[PDB]
Antibody
Framework: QVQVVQSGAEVRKPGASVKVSCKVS????????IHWVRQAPGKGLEWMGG????????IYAQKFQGRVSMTEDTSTNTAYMELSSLRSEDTAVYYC??????????????????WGQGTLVTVSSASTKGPSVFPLAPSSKSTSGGTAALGCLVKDYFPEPVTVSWNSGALTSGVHTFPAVLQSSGLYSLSSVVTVPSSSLGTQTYICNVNHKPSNTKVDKKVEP | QSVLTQPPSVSAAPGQKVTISCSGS????????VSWYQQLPGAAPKLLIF???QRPSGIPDRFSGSKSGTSATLAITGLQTGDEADYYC????????????FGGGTKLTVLGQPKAAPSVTLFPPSSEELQANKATLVCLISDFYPGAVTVAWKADSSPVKAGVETTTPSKQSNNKYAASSYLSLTPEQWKSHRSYSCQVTHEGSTVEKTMAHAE
């Protein structure tokens, strides 16, 4: 039952360091198991480091050499990556990945079969800020044909990301959560909308559950007609 | 030669076969084993093929991989709208320092779809936002194809440029696109005018919806 779980999104200032963790279950880390790969927004995957066939030690890509450290803690089944002298271009999603039990002993080869969920690291000098959450109430403007649109506006936060669910995850059908816009103030904002039977509106409670972990913000907004 | 490349962009229609190639050299694809990954929007990469040709458990027989010379090819048959994703090849490079390579990735676009005109739905500022001495008008743009609109706001027929932000369109779970635009105002600007309008232009056709505080 192989799972891989990373630490949460972080903002750091230029010149600082970040340290991402990676906890694995359903498979025992060897000390040599974990690779790290990152992805800058809208760009391709970039390997950072890991154990290769030949050299019997952890290897780092030449772009990170003087400023990365990758450790693996067998008693805790947890892996860590530390990147220092951070710059703008280090804003990225950072992934750990492993072969798990995809080791072939007739050639030594493994693919990266199990990936963490990713940790977004934002490199900026702007302060962390939690969102305001406002309801987008259903009305006859948002109502046609037995269905109605309602929503939540998640305003003025830094850094990315936020999560929104509806009715603590019971409502998923008809949900659309938009990508954030980065406003000229340097803060983000996004909306999540759901379309529901307009017959429900009297009777069924609709609540958006908004989390912004970098600021420890948790808000559940009830959206009424 | 310590480099993998791929075409940035491939497209085909539901039910067709499409291929994506990964080109390298003697030190990588020439000596080492190729794997392929799928990546949906937001999501971590997922292993599709490993060891040149092998599928993991759970990956359908529509996906296959092969290798020849210093190139490798992913093939997808019976293309589905769900296969719209980014695809990456990977292999170890035996040269130099170097270690694991990925190709720059290929965006696979699935081209089944007919033109659809956007729906436009407006929300006025909420009462809670106004009590906090701000006002945001929200224009939701939905069920359009292709995925390219321009959005403008008007107050009473004159253009409003300041305080507009619009998302780049992204696919809804029914495969048409949606986008959103926000107009920030003062509460007193909102309470004054006869009206504000979101105008959405799509393939040379403009649709608008209009609202006002009095409503």
């Amino acid at each position: 039952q192989v799972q891989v779980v990373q630490s949460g999104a972080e903002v750091r200032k230029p010149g600082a360091s970040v340290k991402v963790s990676c906890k694995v279950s359903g498979f025992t880390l060897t000390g040599l198991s974990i690779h790290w790969v990152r992805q800058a927004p809208g760009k391709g995957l970039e390997w950072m480091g890991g154990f290769g066939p030949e050299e019997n030690e952890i290897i780092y890509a030449q772009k990170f050499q003087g400023r990365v450290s990758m450790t693996e803690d067998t008693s805790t089944n947890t892996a860590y990556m530390e990147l220092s002298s951070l710059r703008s271009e280090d804003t990225a999603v950072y992934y750990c990945a492993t072969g798990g039990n995809y080791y072939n002993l007739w050639t030594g080869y493994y693919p990266l079969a199990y990936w963490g969920q990713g940790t977004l690291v934002t490199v900026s000098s702007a302060s962390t800020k939690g969102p305001s959450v406002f309801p987008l109430a259903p009305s006859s403007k948002s109502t046609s044909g037995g269905t109605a649109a309602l929503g939540c506006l998640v305003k003025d936060y830094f850094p990315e990301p936020v999560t929104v669910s509806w009715n603590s995850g019971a409502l998923t059908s008809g949900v659309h959560t938009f990508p954030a816009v980065l406003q000229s103030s340097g803060l983000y904002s996004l909306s999540s909308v759901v379309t529901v039977p307009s017959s429900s509106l009297g009777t069924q409670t609709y609540i958006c559950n908004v989390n912004h972990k970098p600021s420890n913000t948790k808000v559940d907004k009830k959206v009424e007609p | 030669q310590s480099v993998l490349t791929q075409p940035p962009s491939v497209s085909a229609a539901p039910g067709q076969k499409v291929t994506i190639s990964c080109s390298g050299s003697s030190s990588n694809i020439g000596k080492n084993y190729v794997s392929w990954y799928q990546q949906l929007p937001g999501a971590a990469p997922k292993l599709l093929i490993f060891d040149d040709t092998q599928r993991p458990s759970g990956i359908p027989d529509r996906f296959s991989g092969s290798k020849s010379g210093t190139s490798a090819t992913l093939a997808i048959t019976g293309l589905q709208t769900g296969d719209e994703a980014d695809y990456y090849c990977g292999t170890w490079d035996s040269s130099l320092s170097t270690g694991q390579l990925f190709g720059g990735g290929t965006k696979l676009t699935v081209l089944g779809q007919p033109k659809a005109a956007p729906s436009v739905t407006l929300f006025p500022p909420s009462s809670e936002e106004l009590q906090a001495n701000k006002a945001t008008l929200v224009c939701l743009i939905s069920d359009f194809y292709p995925g390219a609109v321009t959005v403008a706001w008007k107050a009473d027929s004159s253009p409003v440029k300041a305080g507009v932000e619009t998302t780049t369109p992204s696919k809804q779970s029914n495969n048409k696109y949606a986008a959103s635009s926000y107009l920030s105002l003062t509460p007193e600007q909102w309470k004054s005018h006869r009206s504000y309008s979101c105008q959405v232009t799509h393939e040379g056709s403009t649709v608008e919806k209009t609202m006002a505080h009095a409503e």
